[PDB]
């Protein structure tokens, strides 16, 4: 698939480090800030695509959003931070 | 507002993938088959409603049908395939 070569050309090019990168721990792909990623990287590789479109593709290739961790007494989660894990590597 | 929540609860739920989904290429909402969408998904999320009614609501919230692409020597268009784009 063309998607695949594009995903990797994106994630494994360290120049995109501040917007999407392999997590430090675990085996996952982290997007620290959804909006900034969409603005700065997504369109560079997937012209005229949006976040939901991107995520639907990731899903077709086995990548799924990691279960929310609820923090502190507010049980908060930064909705703009997304982490994706592959079903073949739990 | 009630419409909007139903709209997204429908489009962004993976289980509805065969009947309605974000476009692979582009930033649009695709209904590959109108009739199957109406029978299987629409009449589940929007009881007592219909396609036309749904489209008019989409239109009021900024979503419009994407221009028809005429294909091949027959200048054909699949009338049951609908794709909607937001005016932005």
mmCIF file of C-alpha atoms in Angstrom:
data_model
loop_
_atom_site.group_PDB
_atom_site.id
_atom_site.type_symbol
_atom_site.label_atom_id
_atom_site.label_comp_id
_atom_site.label_asym_id
_atom_site.label_seq_id
_atom_site.Cartn_x
_atom_site.Cartn_y
_atom_site.Cartn_z
ATOM 1 C CA UNK A 1 0.000 0.000 0.000
ATOM 2 C CA UNK A 2 0.999 3.567 -0.720
ATOM 3 C CA UNK A 3 -0.291 4.596 2.712
ATOM 4 C CA UNK A 4 2.305 2.445 4.424
ATOM 5 C CA UNK A 5 5.355 3.887 2.599
ATOM 6 C CA UNK A 6 3.936 7.354 3.452
ATOM 7 C CA UNK A 7 3.349 6.612 7.141
ATOM 8 C CA UNK A 8 6.951 5.419 7.570
ATOM 9 C CA UNK A 9 8.472 8.089 5.392
ATOM 10 C CA UNK A 10 6.790 10.353 7.917
ATOM 11 C CA UNK A 11 7.373 8.701 11.257
ATOM 12 C CA UNK A 12 10.952 7.529 10.632
ATOM 13 C CA UNK A 13 12.205 10.871 9.259
ATOM 14 C CA UNK A 14 13.555 12.508 12.445
ATOM 15 C CA UNK A 15 12.802 15.956 11.137
ATOM 16 C CA UNK A 16 9.151 15.296 12.097
ATOM 17 C CA UNK A 17 10.214 14.477 15.660
ATOM 18 C CA UNK A 18 8.379 17.277 17.428
ATOM 19 C CA UNK A 19 5.063 16.264 15.844
ATOM 20 C CA UNK A 20 4.994 12.489 15.597
ATOM 21 C CA UNK A 21 7.560 9.938 16.858
ATOM 22 C CA UNK A 22 8.041 6.413 18.229
ATOM 23 C CA UNK A 23 7.367 6.534 22.004
ATOM 24 C CA UNK A 24 10.296 6.445 24.404
ATOM 25 C CA UNK A 25 8.772 3.458 26.214
ATOM 26 C CA UNK A 26 6.406 0.870 24.812
ATOM 27 C CA UNK A 27 6.118 0.183 21.135
ATOM 28 C CA UNK A 28 3.898 2.976 19.929
ATOM 29 C CA UNK A 29 3.597 6.021 17.718
ATOM 30 C CA UNK A 30 2.997 9.250 19.568
ATOM 31 C CA UNK A 31 1.404 12.458 18.281
ATOM 32 C CA UNK A 32 2.007 14.911 21.172
ATOM 33 C CA UNK A 33 -0.414 17.453 19.719
ATOM 34 C CA UNK A 34 -3.093 16.509 17.176
ATOM 35 C CA UNK A 35 -3.730 20.016 15.859
ATOM 36 C CA UNK A 36 -0.030 20.892 15.402
ATOM 37 C CA UNK A 37 0.604 17.492 13.690
ATOM 38 C CA UNK A 38 -2.276 18.102 11.280
ATOM 39 C CA UNK A 39 -0.953 21.609 10.523
ATOM 40 C CA UNK A 40 2.749 20.796 10.219
ATOM 41 C CA UNK A 41 3.117 17.216 9.071
ATOM 42 C CA UNK A 42 -0.055 15.448 7.953
ATOM 43 C CA UNK A 43 -0.613 17.680 4.962
ATOM 44 C CA UNK A 44 3.013 17.530 3.924
ATOM 45 C CA UNK A 45 2.622 13.786 3.307
ATOM 46 C CA UNK A 46 -1.127 13.399 2.863
ATOM 47 C CA UNK A 47 -2.268 16.481 0.989
ATOM 48 C CA UNK A 48 -5.971 17.240 1.470
ATOM 49 C CA UNK A 49 -6.388 14.659 4.265
ATOM 50 C CA UNK A 50 -7.565 15.292 7.810
ATOM 51 C CA UNK A 51 -6.979 13.624 11.149
ATOM 52 C CA UNK A 52 -9.957 11.289 11.117
ATOM 53 C CA UNK A 53 -9.007 10.157 7.547
ATOM 54 C CA UNK A 54 -5.493 9.466 8.734
ATOM 55 C CA UNK A 55 -6.710 7.529 11.744
ATOM 56 C CA UNK A 56 -9.142 5.478 9.665
ATOM 57 C CA UNK A 57 -6.159 4.389 7.534
ATOM 58 C CA UNK A 58 -4.020 3.554 10.558
ATOM 59 C CA UNK A 59 -6.906 1.424 11.761
ATOM 60 C CA UNK A 60 -6.973 -0.506 8.459
ATOM 61 C CA UNK A 61 -3.292 -1.308 8.954
ATOM 62 C CA UNK A 62 -3.606 -2.494 12.552
ATOM 63 C CA UNK A 63 -2.829 0.735 14.430
ATOM 64 C CA UNK A 64 -5.278 1.722 17.177
ATOM 65 C CA UNK A 65 -5.494 4.492 19.747
ATOM 66 C CA UNK A 66 -4.069 3.475 23.127
ATOM 67 C CA UNK A 67 -6.494 3.344 26.039
ATOM 68 C CA UNK A 68 -6.741 6.649 27.878
ATOM 69 C CA UNK A 69 -4.767 7.042 31.088
ATOM 70 C CA UNK A 70 -6.789 9.208 33.506
ATOM 71 C CA UNK A 71 -4.593 11.512 35.532
ATOM 72 C CA UNK A 72 -4.774 12.814 39.040
ATOM 73 C CA UNK A 73 -7.864 13.698 40.998
ATOM 74 C CA UNK A 74 -9.521 15.203 37.869
ATOM 75 C CA UNK A 75 -9.239 11.954 35.890
ATOM 76 C CA UNK A 76 -7.973 14.156 33.026
ATOM 77 C CA UNK A 77 -6.710 13.320 29.592
ATOM 78 C CA UNK A 78 -5.187 15.664 26.999
ATOM 79 C CA UNK A 79 -7.519 15.042 24.072
ATOM 80 C CA UNK A 80 -4.880 16.476 21.735
ATOM 81 C CA UNK A 81 -2.298 13.814 22.693
ATOM 82 C CA UNK A 82 -2.735 10.556 20.762
ATOM 83 C CA UNK A 83 -0.711 7.385 21.071
ATOM 84 C CA UNK A 84 -1.193 4.472 18.666
ATOM 85 C CA UNK A 85 -0.225 0.805 19.188
ATOM 86 C CA UNK A 86 -0.258 -2.001 16.612
ATOM 87 C CA UNK A 87 -2.416 -5.076 17.286
ATOM 88 C CA UNK A 88 0.520 -7.324 16.373
ATOM 89 C CA UNK A 89 2.696 -5.814 19.153
ATOM 90 C CA UNK A 90 0.957 -5.491 22.572
ATOM 91 C CA UNK B 1 -26.753 20.454 18.062
ATOM 92 C CA UNK B 2 -28.667 17.232 18.562
ATOM 93 C CA UNK B 3 -28.061 16.516 14.863
ATOM 94 C CA UNK B 4 -24.327 17.145 15.080
ATOM 95 C CA UNK B 5 -23.806 14.680 17.921
ATOM 96 C CA UNK B 6 -25.798 12.031 16.075
ATOM 97 C CA UNK B 7 -23.895 12.782 12.886
ATOM 98 C CA UNK B 8 -20.473 12.230 14.473
ATOM 99 C CA UNK B 9 -21.611 9.421 16.748
ATOM 100 C CA UNK B 10 -22.507 7.774 13.409
ATOM 101 C CA UNK B 11 -19.595 8.695 11.182
ATOM 102 C CA UNK B 12 -16.819 8.227 13.717
ATOM 103 C CA UNK B 13 -18.053 4.859 15.020
ATOM 104 C CA UNK B 14 -15.971 2.204 13.158
ATOM 105 C CA UNK B 15 -18.878 -0.177 13.148
ATOM 106 C CA UNK B 16 -20.585 1.973 10.503
ATOM 107 C CA UNK B 17 -17.572 1.738 8.133
ATOM 108 C CA UNK B 18 -19.265 -0.137 5.259
ATOM 109 C CA UNK B 19 -22.137 2.395 5.053
ATOM 110 C CA UNK B 20 -20.595 5.773 5.842
ATOM 111 C CA UNK B 21 -16.946 6.801 6.399
ATOM 112 C CA UNK B 22 -14.337 9.533 5.972
ATOM 113 C CA UNK B 23 -12.802 9.454 2.513
ATOM 114 C CA UNK B 24 -9.562 7.546 1.937
ATOM 115 C CA UNK B 25 -8.286 10.487 -0.126
ATOM 116 C CA UNK B 26 -9.616 13.931 0.568
ATOM 117 C CA UNK B 27 -11.477 15.360 3.521
ATOM 118 C CA UNK B 28 -14.986 14.230 2.789
ATOM 119 C CA UNK B 29 -17.709 12.025 4.202
ATOM 120 C CA UNK B 30 -18.568 9.185 1.872
ATOM 121 C CA UNK B 31 -21.810 7.194 1.629
ATOM 122 C CA UNK B 32 -20.816 4.437 -0.857
ATOM 123 C CA UNK B 33 -24.392 3.286 -1.179
ATOM 124 C CA UNK B 34 -27.299 5.518 -0.340
ATOM 125 C CA UNK B 35 -29.940 2.820 -0.094
ATOM 126 C CA UNK B 36 -27.886 0.550 2.177
ATOM 127 C CA UNK B 37 -26.950 3.544 4.331
ATOM 128 C CA UNK B 38 -30.587 4.522 4.733
ATOM 129 C CA UNK B 39 -31.752 0.973 5.557
ATOM 130 C CA UNK B 40 -28.870 -0.059 7.838
ATOM 131 C CA UNK B 41 -27.520 3.051 9.505
ATOM 132 C CA UNK B 42 -29.785 6.050 9.078
ATOM 133 C CA UNK B 43 -32.934 4.367 10.323
ATOM 134 C CA UNK B 44 -31.003 3.228 13.414
ATOM 135 C CA UNK B 45 -29.529 6.580 14.468
ATOM 136 C CA UNK B 46 -32.342 8.723 13.078
ATOM 137 C CA UNK B 47 -35.532 6.746 13.580
ATOM 138 C CA UNK B 48 -38.417 7.968 11.418
ATOM 139 C CA UNK B 49 -36.219 9.927 9.035
ATOM 140 C CA UNK B 50 -35.095 9.700 5.446
ATOM 141 C CA UNK B 51 -32.192 10.492 3.136
ATOM 142 C CA UNK B 52 -33.530 13.777 1.885
ATOM 143 C CA UNK B 53 -34.243 14.856 5.444
ATOM 144 C CA UNK B 54 -30.742 13.884 6.502
ATOM 145 C CA UNK B 55 -29.148 15.755 3.607
ATOM 146 C CA UNK B 56 -31.089 18.929 4.295
ATOM 147 C CA UNK B 57 -29.758 18.804 7.897
ATOM 148 C CA UNK B 58 -26.202 18.272 6.662
ATOM 149 C CA UNK B 59 -26.691 21.193 4.340
ATOM 150 C CA UNK B 60 -27.756 23.413 7.215
ATOM 151 C CA UNK B 61 -24.652 22.442 9.161
ATOM 152 C CA UNK B 62 -22.318 23.222 6.262
ATOM 153 C CA UNK B 63 -21.958 19.879 4.483
ATOM 154 C CA UNK B 64 -22.676 19.685 0.748
ATOM 155 C CA UNK B 65 -22.640 17.058 -1.957
ATOM 156 C CA UNK B 66 -19.419 16.925 -3.896
ATOM 157 C CA UNK B 67 -19.547 17.638 -7.630
ATOM 158 C CA UNK B 68 -20.238 14.635 -9.813
ATOM 159 C CA UNK B 69 -17.323 13.059 -11.675
ATOM 160 C CA UNK B 70 -18.594 11.689 -15.014
ATOM 161 C CA UNK B 71 -16.704 8.532 -15.831
ATOM 162 C CA UNK B 72 -15.645 6.881 -19.033
ATOM 163 C CA UNK B 73 -17.251 7.097 -22.468
ATOM 164 C CA UNK B 74 -20.742 6.933 -20.916
ATOM 165 C CA UNK B 75 -20.167 10.006 -18.725
ATOM 166 C CA UNK B 76 -21.648 7.854 -15.944
ATOM 167 C CA UNK B 77 -22.249 8.616 -12.289
ATOM 168 C CA UNK B 78 -23.269 6.140 -9.559
ATOM 169 C CA UNK B 79 -26.399 7.960 -8.234
ATOM 170 C CA UNK B 80 -26.219 5.893 -5.012
ATOM 171 C CA UNK B 81 -22.629 7.040 -4.181
ATOM 172 C CA UNK B 82 -22.669 10.344 -2.278
ATOM 173 C CA UNK B 83 -19.696 12.293 -0.923
ATOM 174 C CA UNK B 84 -20.095 15.458 1.167
ATOM 175 C CA UNK B 85 -17.592 18.256 1.828
ATOM 176 C CA UNK B 86 -17.706 21.068 4.343
ATOM 177 C CA UNK B 87 -17.730 24.634 3.075
ATOM 178 C CA UNK B 88 -14.830 24.918 5.588
#
